[PDB]
RNA sequence: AAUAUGAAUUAAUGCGAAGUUGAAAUACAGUUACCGUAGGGGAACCUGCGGUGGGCUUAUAAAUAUCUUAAAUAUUCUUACA
RNA sequence: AGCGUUAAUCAUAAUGGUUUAAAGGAUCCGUAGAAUGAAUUAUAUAUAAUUUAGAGUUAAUAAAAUUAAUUAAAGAAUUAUAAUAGUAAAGAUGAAAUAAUAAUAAUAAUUAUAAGACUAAUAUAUGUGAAAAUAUUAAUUAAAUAUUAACUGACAUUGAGGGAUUAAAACUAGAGUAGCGAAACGGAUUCGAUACCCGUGUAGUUCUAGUAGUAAACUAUGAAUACAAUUAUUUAUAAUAUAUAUAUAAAUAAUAAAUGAAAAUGAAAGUAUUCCACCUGAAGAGUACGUUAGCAAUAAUGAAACUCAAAACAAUAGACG
């Protein structure tokens, strides 16, 4: 904190980002292939059965991706696109399968927030 | 204790209130306080003379002001260690008042222990009203004591009848002694006269003392007997 | 001599106000009797009056007869008597 | 006659004349001027019809205060 | 560090010491001749 | 020197805090100039040469015989239970000494932060050294002197 | 030569799950706790040696006290007296 | 005529801190510093000539006998052996036992030898030392305080790297080994007792020569300079007319102000200036890998992934012991 010390490398610490999604490799989505599809127990104390999956991305690295919505159509080989969200209650899963695209179909009978899932406009 | 802003800024705080309309009516004191402002300047002021002696506080004796040789015959050619230290605390700390008379007083009561036994009233009568010519010792409002002697000594010193202080002191002492002897003779002869003309004193001083001792002795005796009994058991 | 100034205390007060009362007469008599019965065998008539005196003492109750307020002056005068510097 | 040499609030330094007999002695010309100033303000509030309140918790002070 | 916080550090240090004690023969084997 | 100047400023601040009336300072030329500038702006009540022990009544010439014991006595100033000389922060510190051109000084005067100096305030005084002569920053601008921005009093 | 990836087997560590064994720490935590270090023990830990307080400043009595006009005088006094 | 979302960028607190929350290096010494650093005048931040206030040098006069290293002494006790006389228990513990205890004659007592290792009071670690440290005595050599006189003339401060010293434990040699005492074995305790208690008691503790360079190496507070309001204690210095009341310093204890998250700091944690060290959420981690050094234990250097919205301090009021 002396003037000399400041000159030879000292100052306020600066943080930009540590990247929330490192395996995604600085891009919005990556295509992947599901390996297995699980049902995870959440962290204490909120409880459910979370429909996560394991996905090998095109870049190579493997990732535990969450699957949102009520109903999920995902096998052991389905084409699936991954984005950089985070399932907060499940530890060690830092990704979401984006749901309109790929073999993952749009969530059925969705009325609210349709673009957040795959749901098309019902068209009367 | 921090210097309080809020004890002296009273009228300002009320003036603000009056301006606002928090106060509808002005206080009785408001105009008076405006007329006669507080000090509000709580400084440490420096002092340059000792008032009792008349010594100078602020000044420093220089090397050029001391040309002649010192004790042990060395000429001062440099400032010493104390002449470089910044003596500001002396300007601010209040002066110890010293008098030549205090030493004389101390001497007198050493020489005359039994003058202490003469009781002294310290409750002052009007100090401005008095007007003592110390040509003589016996002043009217003042009694005869060591103080009067000392005042006489000081007067002699001032007038330069005795240039030396000690001689003046001795002279004052000798003046005092004669007066004291006269006082002593007065009382005894007055007592004799009283005895002659059939005056009757119920309790003499020595008799009083004996009586006083007697009560104490009686108190002691009962206690002492109890203590002896306790010791036995 | 070496003066000893205390720090600022919460409350100047004697820790325990022992009163220091005199020992009981009946107990003393009993001790004396015990001492006598040490000597002179079990119950010889050298301690004939002592036993009677003990009995007289311990007739109504086992003991015959059945506080120091120094806190008030210390408590009162602590704040004065301190050499605590000004506020 | 001020308090004592060891019981000195140095805030009051300007008022004191010197020390003597192990006692700070209050400058009395200063005392006089402050007294006059105080006396004048006392007179003023009495003239205006203000409520003057004399506060004196020490032992002997009561009668003179009343 | 409070004492409570220090106790975690102490525990860690103990574990490390234990690990070192365990892996003495293994460490020796690794060190000599390579 | 600039360290000395900083020390005297700190001493002034200390004296303002406790409300002393009359305060000693070291007897140098720069220091004297600074004191004179303060006096003229109106922060000091008095300024007078003197001994280490006190201010001098009569004139005493300063020589190698005196110089070590010589001192600059300075009267401080108070009004309505508030000291006049509140602060004495210096700007050109010994390690990062700053020297402005006339334009920069003008900008500072007109409410522009320059070289990380907060621009000068309503009742403030930024002193400026220019060819070993301390001035007000406004005075320096008027005369057009590129100078060292010394210090700041408020 | 340096760098990168792979390796049977293996170690540390994290997260979840609250199972088992003790009960080491927090109060004098029921052997004061911790630092360094050494040896021992299923596991927390135990023991030696010096250090530290972030534990004991948490500190609070062997007791005795005096004489001058007690009043026709002090006690009363409302800008008087002098 | 986009709206969401993801991936990114910029802004969003250093107009910061490190006694107790992350953070003062164990300590000093001292090199570089493109770090900082007195006075006056004159030259066109520098040169030059003058100054002595910082920093030194040498005397003189007072004091002080402390800290190193080395050499030479003293002492209470302890254990062991032997003798004397003497009699059945002794020693231990919460209470008990086991044991080189005791009917081979002990323990206690009195003597007499030897051996190591420790240093009761004074003692406050006051003080002294850079810090580790340092109180039985003496000697030697080294270093040390204050004030005067004279001299030097800014020669200073701090100090990356570097260097030296650095408790206890540990290690390598060679002596030494009374007492204590990791480990080990045995006796208790306990449901169990790899413990707390007791008994044998080896390394170790001791010295000589080294290695190593860490500790709650702590005032958990880097060094230096200038400055600021009081009181009480001692200590030393000077004057006073040797024992008085005074002027100085120095330390210690209470505070004012000020600072502070508060606890509290109090001539510093205040006001300022200079220089160095160090910190930037918690876990993972002072770990791994690598390198250097070491006889070794290890010491220094010192990452990342993975995972959380935690984690920490001062103080408050309870409950609890
Ligand atoms: Mg929704
Ligand atoms: Mg919709
Ligand atoms: Mg910390
Ligand atoms: Mg190779
Ligand atoms: Mg493998
Ligand atoms: Mg159990
Ligand atoms: Mg324990
Ligand atoms: Mg206990
Ligand atoms: Mg426990
Ligand atoms: Mg315990
Ligand atoms: Mg236990
Ligand atoms: Mg063990
Ligand atoms: Mg221990
Ligand atoms: Mg505790
Ligand atoms: Mg405590
Ligand atoms: Mg910024
Ligand atoms: Mg802080
Ligand atoms: Mg330190
Ligand atoms: Mg540290
Ligand atoms: Mg030091
Ligand atoms: Mg001793
Ligand atoms: Mg240095
Ligand atoms: Mg030690
Ligand atoms: Mg050793
Ligand atoms: Mg050995
Ligand atoms: Mg044992
Ligand atoms: Mg070495
Ligand atoms: Mg270590
Ligand atoms: Mg360390
Ligand atoms: Mg230590
Ligand atoms: Mg305060
Ligand atoms: Mg601050
Ligand atoms: Mg304090
Ligand atoms: Mg590496
Ligand atoms: Mg290491």
- Residue whose C-alpha is closest to residue F12's, from F43, F41, F48: F43
Q: How large is the C-alpha radius of gyration of chain B?
A: 33
To which residue do tokens 């002691």 refer? Answer: B220
Taking the C-alpha atoms of residue C55 and residue C26, their distance in angstroms, rounded to an integer, is 9
Cα of E24 to ligand 25 centre, how many Å? 24
Of D30, D21, D27, D4, give the one whose Cα is nearest residue B99: D21
> How many residues comprise chain A?
124
Taking the CA of residue D55 and the nearest CA in chain C, the distance in Å comes to: 21
Whether the Cβ atoms of residue B27 and residue B14 lie closer than 8 Å to each other: yes
Question: Residues of B with CB below 8 A from F63's CB?
Answer: 64
Residue with minimal CA–C1' distance to G43 is: E15
Ligand number with the minimum distance to the CA of E13: 28
* Separation in Å, CA A71 to CA A97, B171, B227, F74: 13, 128, 108, 87
Q: Are F120 and F113 in contact (CB under 8 A)?
A: no
| Tokens 């058991």, residue located | B233
Which two three-digit tokens encode residue E33? Answer: 């001749």
Sheet holding F125-129, edge to edge: F99-100, F147-153, F125-129, F134-136
| Nearest C-alpha in A relative to F93 | A3
- Asked if strand H contacts A26 at the CB level, meaning under 7 A, the answer is yes
CB F137 within 8 A of CB F105: yes
| Closest C-alpha to F63, from A16, C1, B160, B77 | B77
Inspect the interface and report whether the beta carbons of D9 and C83 lie closer than 8 Å.
no
Residue numbers in F 32-61, CB below 7 Å of strand H: none
Within 10 Å of residue F147's Cβ, how many Cβ atoms?
23
Alpha carbon of B180: minimum distance to chain F alpha carbons (Å): 51
Which residues in chain F belong to E strands, given as ranges? 22-26, 46-51, 70-75, 99-100, 125-129, 134-136, 147-153
Measured between beta carbons, the chain C residues lying within 8 angstroms of D7 are 86
Q: Is strand G in 7 Å reach of the CB of C80?
A: no
Nearest-CA residue to the C1' of G16? A43
Q: Strand G: which positions are within 7 A of a protein CB?
A: 11-18, 25-26, 33-37, 40-41, 43-45, 54-55, 57, 59-63, 67-68, 76
**Cα F3 from Cα F8, distance rounded (Å):** 9
| CA E23 / ligand 34 centre spacing (Å) | 21
Peptide bond into A45 cis (omega under 30): yes
What separation in Å is there between the alpha carbon of A21 and the centre of ligand 5? 27
Chain A residues closer than 8 Å to F95 by CB: 3-4
Spatial separation of the C-alpha atoms in residues C70 and C55, rounded to whole Å: 38
Question: CA of F70 to nearest chain B CA: how many angstroms apart?
Answer: 8
Please tell me the distance between residue E7's alpha carbon and the centre of ligand 9 in angstroms: 14
Q: Name F128's bridge partners.
A: F135, F149
The three-class DSSP label of residue F71 is strand
Q: Tokens 């470089």 map to which residue?
A: B84
For residues A30, A32, A38, A39, the Cα torsion angle rounded to the nearest 10 degrees is 30
- Indicate the pairing of strand A52-57 with strand A29-37: antiparallel
User: How far is ligand 31, taken at its centre, from the CA of residue C85, in Å?
Assistant: 13
Q: Give the closest residue to A34 by CA, choosing from A115, A107, A95.
A: A95
Asked if strand H contacts D13 at the CB level, meaning under 7 A, the answer is yes
A94 touches strand H (CB under 7 A): yes
The C-alpha angle F77, F80, F84, rounded to 5 degrees, equals 30
User: Does chain D reach chain B with at least 3 CB pairs under 8 Å?
Assistant: yes
Q: Is the CB of B110 under 7 A from strand H?
A: no
Q: CB–CB of B46 and F51 under 8 A?
A: no
Q: Is the CB of C17 under 7 A from strand G?
A: yes
Instruction: Give me the CA F48–C1' G5 separation in Å, rounded.
Output: 84
Give CA–CA dist F89/F16, Å, rounded: 14
Which residues from 5-34 of E have any strand G atom under 7 Å from their CB?
A: 6-7, 9-11, 13-15, 18-19, 21, 23
Cβ pair F136, F33 in contact under 8 A: no
After which residues does chain C become discontinuous at a C–N distance over 2.5 Å?
66
Are C36 and C50 in contact by the 8 Å Cβ rule? The answer is yes
Helix, strand counts (H, E) of chain F: 4, 7
**Dihedral of alpha carbons F66, F67, F68, F74, sign:** positive
Q: How far apart are CA C29 and CA C50, in angstroms?
A: 7
Measure B19 CA to nearest chain D CA, in Å: 21
Collapsed DSSP state (helix, strand, coil) of residue C49: helix
Q: What's the CA gap between D15 and B224, in Å, rounded?
A: 58
Closest by Cα among D20, D9, D11, D10 to D1: D20
Contact D5, C83 (CB under 8 A): no
CA distance F40 to F33: 11
Q: For this experimental structure, what is the resolution in angstroms? A: 3.8
d(CA F103, CA F146): 9
Which residues between 51 and 110 in chain F have a beta carbon less than 8 angstroms from any beta carbon of chain A?
A: 95-96
Task: Compute CA distances D2 → B102, B122, D22, D23, whole Å.
Answer: 20, 17, 10, 6
- Whose tokens are 């490799």? That residue is A25
Contact of B63 with F65, CB cutoff 8 Å: yes
User: Residue F128 carries which DSSP code?
Assistant: E
Among C79, C81, C85, C87, the strongest candidate for a mutation testing the D interface, having the largest count of D CBs within 10 A, is C85
Say if strands D24-26 and A29-37 run parallel, antiparallel, or are unpaired: unpaired
F41: its two tokens? 């702006």
Q: Which chains touch C (3 or more CB pairs under 8 A)?
A: D
* Chain F residues 101-130 within 7 Å (CB) of strand H: 118
B136 CB-near residues (< 8 Å, 6+ apart)? B152, B175
Chains D and E touch (3+ CB pairs under 8 A): no
Helix (H, G, I), strand (E, B) or coil at F148: strand
């Amino acid at each position: 904190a002396t003037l000399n010390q400041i000159k030879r490398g000292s100052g306020p610490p600066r943080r930009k980002k540590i990247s929330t999604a490192p395996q995604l490799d600085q891009c919005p989505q990556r295509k992947g292939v599901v390996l297995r599809v699980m049902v995870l127990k959440p962290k204490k104390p909120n409880s459910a059965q979370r429909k996560a999956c394991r996905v090998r991305l095109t870049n190579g690295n493997v990732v535990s991706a969450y699957i949102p919505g009520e109903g999920h159509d995902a096998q052991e080989h389905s084409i699936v696109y991954v984005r950089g969200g985070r399932c907060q209650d499940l530890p060690g899963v830092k990704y979401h399968v984006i749901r309109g695209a790929g073999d993952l179909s749009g969530v059925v009978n969705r009325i609210s927030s349709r673009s957040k899932y795959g749901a098309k406009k019902p068209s009367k | 204790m921090k210097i309080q802003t809020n004890a002296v800024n009273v009228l300002q705080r009320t003036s603000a209130y009056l301006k606002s309309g928090l106060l509808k009516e002005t206080p009785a004191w408001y105009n008076v306080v405006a007329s006669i402002p507080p000090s509000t300047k709580f400084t440490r002021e420096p002092r340059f003379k000792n008032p009792s002696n008349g010594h100078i506080i602020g000044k420093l004796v220089d090397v050029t002001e001391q040309p002649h040789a010192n004790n042990k015959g060395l000429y001062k050619t440099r400032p010493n260690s104390s002449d470089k230290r910044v003596g500001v605390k002396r300007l601010y700390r209040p002066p110890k008042l010293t008098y030549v008379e205090d030493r004389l007083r101390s001497l007198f009561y050493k020489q005359h222990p039994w003058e202490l036994s003469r009781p002294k009233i310290l409750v002052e009568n009007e100090i401005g009203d008095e007007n003592y010519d110390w040509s003589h010792m016996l002043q009217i409002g003042r009694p005869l004591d060591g103080e009067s002697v000392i005042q006489r000594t000081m007067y002699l010193i001032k007038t330069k009848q005795y240039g030396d202080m000690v001689e003046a002191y001795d002279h004052a002492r000798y003046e005092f002694y004669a007066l004291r002897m006269q006082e002593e003779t007065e009382q005894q002869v007055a007592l004799e006269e009283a005895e002659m003309f059939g005056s009757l004193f119920g309790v003499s001083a020595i008799e009083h003392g004996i009586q006083k001792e007697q009560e104490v002795l009686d108190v002691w005796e009962k206690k002492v007997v109890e203590e002896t009994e306790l010791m036995a058991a | 001599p070496p003066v000893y100034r205390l720090p600022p205390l919460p409350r100047l007060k004697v820790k325990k106000p022992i009163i220091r009362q005199e020992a009981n007469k009946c107990l003393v008599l009993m001790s004396n009797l015990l001492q006598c019965w040490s000597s002179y065998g079990h119950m010889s008539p050298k301690c004939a009056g002592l036993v009677t005196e003990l009995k007289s003492c311990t007739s109504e109750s086992a003991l015959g007869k059945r506080k120091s307020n120094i806190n008030y002056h210390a408590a009162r005068l602590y704040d004065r008597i301190n050499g605590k510097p000004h506020d | 006659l001020g308090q004592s040499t060891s019981l000195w609030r140095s805030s009051t330094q300007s008022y004191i004349y010197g020390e003597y007999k192990g006692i700070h002695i209050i400058d009395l010309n200063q005392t006089l001027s402050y007294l006059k100033r105080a006396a004048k303000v006392v007179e003023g509030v009495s003239e205006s019809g203000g409520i003057i309140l004399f506060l004196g918790t020490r032992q002997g002070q009561k009668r003179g205060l009343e | 560090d409070s004492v409570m916080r220090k106790r975690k550090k102490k525990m860690k240090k103990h574990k490390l010491r234990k690990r070192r004690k365990r892996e003495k023969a293994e460490r020796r084997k690794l060190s000599q001749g390579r | 020197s600039l360290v000395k100047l900083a020390n005297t400023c700190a001493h002034l601040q200390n004296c303002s805090k406790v409300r002393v009336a009359l305060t000693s300072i070291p007897y140098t030329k720069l220091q004297l100039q600074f004191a004179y500038n303060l006096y003229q702006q109106g922060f000091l009540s008095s300024l007078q040469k003197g001994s280490t022990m006190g201010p001098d009544k009569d004139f005493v010439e300063v020589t190698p015989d005196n110089i070590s014991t010589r001192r600059l006595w300075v009267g401080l100033k108070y009004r309505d239970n508030k000291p006049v000389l509140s602060s004495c922060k210096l700007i050109s510190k010994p390690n990062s000494r700053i020297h402005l051109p006339m334009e920069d000084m003008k900008k500072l005067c007109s409410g522009v932060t320059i070289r990380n100096i907060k621009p000068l305030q309503p009742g403030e005084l930024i002193l400026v050294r220019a060819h070993n002569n301390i001035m007000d920053i406004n005075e320096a601008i008027s005369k057009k002197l590129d100078g060292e921005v010394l210090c700041r009093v408020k």
